[PDB]
Structures are given as C-alpha cells and as structure tokens.
Design a protein around this ligand. Structure first.
Ligand code: HEM
Length: 453
C-alpha cells in the first residue's frame, strides 16, 4: 500500500540539513534509521534523497534493470578532482565503460598472482616496523594500515614507492588528499556550497588538488625515467585499447584514474584492517582462532599466493568486519523510470536512493538477533540476495574487491603469525569519517613471537 515516507525533523528552509552538522554524519544517519526504520527521506536545500536500510528494499535498489548508480552529492564534489574516473563517472559516460573494459583484467583474481610479491614487499616493511619497536612504545593502528595500503597501491599499481614507513610525518600527497576529503565533507554541510563566502576553502581545495596532480606528474615522470617495462595499471592505461571501441584512454582520463586508484586503493582497505584488528583485540577467542590458522598455514618465511587463499577464517574475519563497519559506507542510485519501491514508495524517474550499508548489515530479518556481535562464523556456511554489500552493487561494484581482500588477508595473516596484541589502553571505539570510515586513536602494543622473515 502506498505509504507516506518517514522523515526526520526539519528546520524551515534548511530542511533536514542541520541534522548532519557533525563530524560523524554516517553514524548520525544510522541513528535516524534506528529511529525511523527501513526508509526515510532526507532533504537539504536543492536536493532530496531517500536512505534505505533493509534488505527488503535494498534488493530492489540493486536491480540494475530499475536503478543505476547515481553520483551522490559527495561524489559530485569528489568529482572536482576525480573527474570521469571510474568511481565518479556515470554508467552512461563514454569513459566509464571504456576504462572498465581496459582495466578489469588488471583486477581479477588471476592478476593477484602478479601483484602478490609487491604486496609482500610492503607487508614485510609493516612487520619489520613493529618488530623494531621498543618496549615502551605502541602501534598507531589506522596510521600504520594507511602506510601499508597507500604503499601497496603505489607499488602494485604504479611501480612507485611512497616509502610511507620511512616517514613519521604523513606523506604530502595524503596531507592534501585528507584535506580535500575534509573539504568535501564540510561542503556537504553548507546550505549554498557555491556561496562566494567559501571562496577561501575553494582556494585551499584547489591547492590540494594541485598537490595531487603534482604527484601524478612525478609518477608519470618516474615511469619514463626508470625506463622499465611493466604490466601495472599505468601501463595498461597508456597502451591498452578498449576492445569494444578500439580506442585507448586520453591522458586527461588516465590522470583521473591515477588519483582515483591512489585514493580508493588505500581508504577502504586501511579502515578494514584497522577495524579487523580492533575486533580481534576485543574478541580474544576469535583472535586465538585467527592466530591458529595463521600459524598452521603460513609455514614459510613469507606467504605465498596459495597460502593466502587458504586463510579461510581470516577471510571470514574480514567479512565480519566489513559487515559491522563497511568502510565505504554508502552508495547512491537513481530510478531509471517511474516505479514503486517495496509496494509502498512511489518514485519518479531520476529520484535518488542511498544504500546505508552499516544499517543493511544490521538487518535482523536477514542476519538474526545477534547483529551487534562480532561472529565470523556467520560466514562459515548461504546468505540472501543483496544482504551483504560492502563492495557496492552490480557492474558498478568495487573493481578493487579482490585486490583489497588479498592484501588484507595477507597482512592480517602475517600480523597474527608474528605478534600477540595487547589492548593496553582498553580502547573505546571511535570512528572517524572522511566519507570513508576508520577507527581513530586505536592503539595497541605488539609482543613479537620472534619468528624470522
Ligand atoms: C575494503 C576495501 C574497499 C571497499 C570497502 C570498497 C568499496 C567500494 C564500493 C562500495 C564501491 C561502489 C561505490 C558507489 O557505488 O558509488 C567501490 C567502487 C570502486 N572501488 Fe572499491 N572498495 C575497496 C577497495 C578498493 C581498492 C583496493 C580499489 C583499487 C585498487 C578500489 C577501486 C574502486 C573503484 C575504481 C571503484 C569504482 C568502480 C566502478 O564504478 O567502475 N576499491 N568500492
């Protein structure tokens, strides 16, 4: 039956916008969803979207005959620096399908055998850093996972070394990228984002975009100077031809892809690794089970590709981390035609819906009563269509899913092979939002098991 859609408190002409005047908007949206249920409208000046939280509705949103990817307001702002790169292009834009076809083979399960050695290079640097800490020191978890994930995509993708583990001050590229993302988040909170009152933030934003483009220049210059032949992402982009069209990407689009991969390659995965260790230190029995599997499987000084694929319980741990805290916590869709959602909510062509992934992942009708518990065994055996969506949906799902999960499986495996962890501060979870999610202030101490590399 057609029903009126729930909607939270409005503030005159500002509509719902003041509800998200917070540094933790996705967490605030989860609270609204707790209060209003599976669907609610959220208006701000000049835009409307509808936040979905149940598998019953999200399964319909994920029907590609009915909905296509939408550029949320956040993506539209991110597009100021990512352009028509893969993540910020419309499905119908020429460069989407073109770049997709050119790059997809670079991200398959098979391409992972190729990247494995270089993933190991950076994982070893992480393990060595932690082996070299003195007794009175600790680990800043999200910070070190970011060093690893950035360096891994730099190296695997572009044969470029960020050398993040040689730095205690974060890489200039990351300083600017984080500030650009912070600006996007602040811009989402403005009534009139084009107001010339914000021309200063715009100045800084453009300076940070220049910094990102300066790094792209260095990556391209290094490629030309090192004068080696590689089959990495950049090589595929410079020479690869779209089999559908028979054209290569233009330099402008390649530049956008480089920045896209550096961002995306690192943000999601670093949060996943940090959430996973967090859950392990809070769920000691699960830790023991991971440690047992690492010790049992990782019998060589460094992991092989085949050994990583045998870390089945580590993979379950990672999926359960993604269930509770999917690190790219939403994605947006638009109605391809006039339709009715859920037998209940009429939509007009172009109307936007937002999939609130953390809420979908707490839907008791799919998962059972215990959704707040960290229980990797969930994945042991058979879950429903579109209940678990940490990598988005359909042909606009993450191109990085296998890359991210191979890396994180490798790294978490090595971490638990080589160390025991202590939650020395009895850390209370604090989730930082930079569009993506990651723990803030999560610290531990590691006690080496003294197993050489
Ligand atoms: C745990 C790690 C990661 C998570 C949770 C994640 C999540 C996502 C999600 C939710 C989307 C869809 C967003 C939307 O519909 O608007 C997406 C798209 C994307 N992901 Fe990831 N991802 C991760 C790792 C990576 C990595 C490692 C790469 C690259 C190396 C990457 C590259 C991309 C790209 C390029 C897209 C756009 C794909 C397309 O539309 O053609 N991702 N990912």
């Amino acid at each position: 039956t057609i029903k009126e859609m729930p909607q939270p408190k409005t503030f005159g002409e500002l509509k719902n916008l003041p509800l998200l005047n917070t540094d933790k908007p996705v967490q605030a949206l989860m609270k609204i969803a707790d209060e209003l249920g599976e669907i609610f409208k959220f208006e701000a000046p000049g835009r409307v979207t509808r936040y979905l939280s149940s598998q019953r509705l999200i399964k319909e949103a994920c029907d590609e005959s009915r909905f296509d990817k939408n550029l949320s307001q956040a993506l539209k702002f991110v597009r100021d620096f990512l352009g028509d790169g893969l993540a910020t292009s419309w499905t119908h834009e020429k460069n989407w399908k073109k770049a997709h076809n050119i790059l997809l083979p670079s991200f398959s399960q098979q391409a992972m055998k190729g990247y494995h050695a270089m993933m190991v290079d950076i994982a070893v640097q992480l393990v060595q850093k932690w082996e070299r800490l003195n007794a009175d020191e600790h680990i800043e978890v999200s910070e070190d996972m970011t060093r690893l994930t950035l360096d891994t995509i730099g190296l695997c993708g572009f044969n470029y070394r960020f050398n993040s583990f040689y730095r205690d001050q974060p890489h200039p590229f990351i300083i600017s990228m984080v500030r650009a993302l912070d600006e996007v988040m602040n811009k989402l909170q403005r009534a009139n984002p084009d107001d010339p009152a914000y021309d200063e933030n715009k100045r800084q934003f453009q300076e940070d975009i220049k910094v990102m483009n300066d790094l792209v220049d260095k990556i391209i210059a290094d490629r030309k100077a090192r004068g080696e032949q590689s089959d990495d992402l950049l090589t595929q982009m410079l020479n690869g031809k779209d089999p559908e069209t028979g054209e290569p990407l233009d330099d402008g689009n390649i530049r956008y892809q480089i920045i896209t991969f550096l961002l995306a390659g690192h943000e999601g995965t670093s949060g996943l690794l940090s959430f996973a260790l967090y859950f392990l230190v809070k769920n000691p029995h699960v830790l023991q089970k991971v440690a047992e599997e690492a010790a049992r499987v990782l019998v060589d000084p460094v992991p092989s590709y085949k050994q990583v694929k045998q870390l089945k319980y580590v993979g379950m741990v990672l999926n359960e981390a993604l269930r509770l805290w999917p690190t790219v916590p939403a994605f947006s869709l638009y109605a391809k035609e006039d339709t009715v959602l859920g037998g209940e909510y009429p939509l007009e062509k172009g109307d936007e819906v937002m999939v609130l992934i953390p809420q979908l992942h707490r839907d008791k009708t799919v998962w059972g009563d215990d959704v707040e518990e960290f229980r990797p065994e969930r994945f042991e055996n058979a879950i429903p269509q579109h209940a678990f969506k940490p990598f988005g949906n359909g042909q606009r799902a993450s191109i990085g899913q296998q890359f991210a999960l191979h890396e994180a499986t490798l790294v978490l495996g090595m971490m638990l092979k080589h160390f025991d962890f202590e939650d020395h501060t009895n850390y209370e979870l604090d989730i930082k939002e930079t569009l993506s999610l990651k723990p803030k202030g999560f610290v531990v101490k590691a006690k080496s098991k003294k197993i050489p590399l």
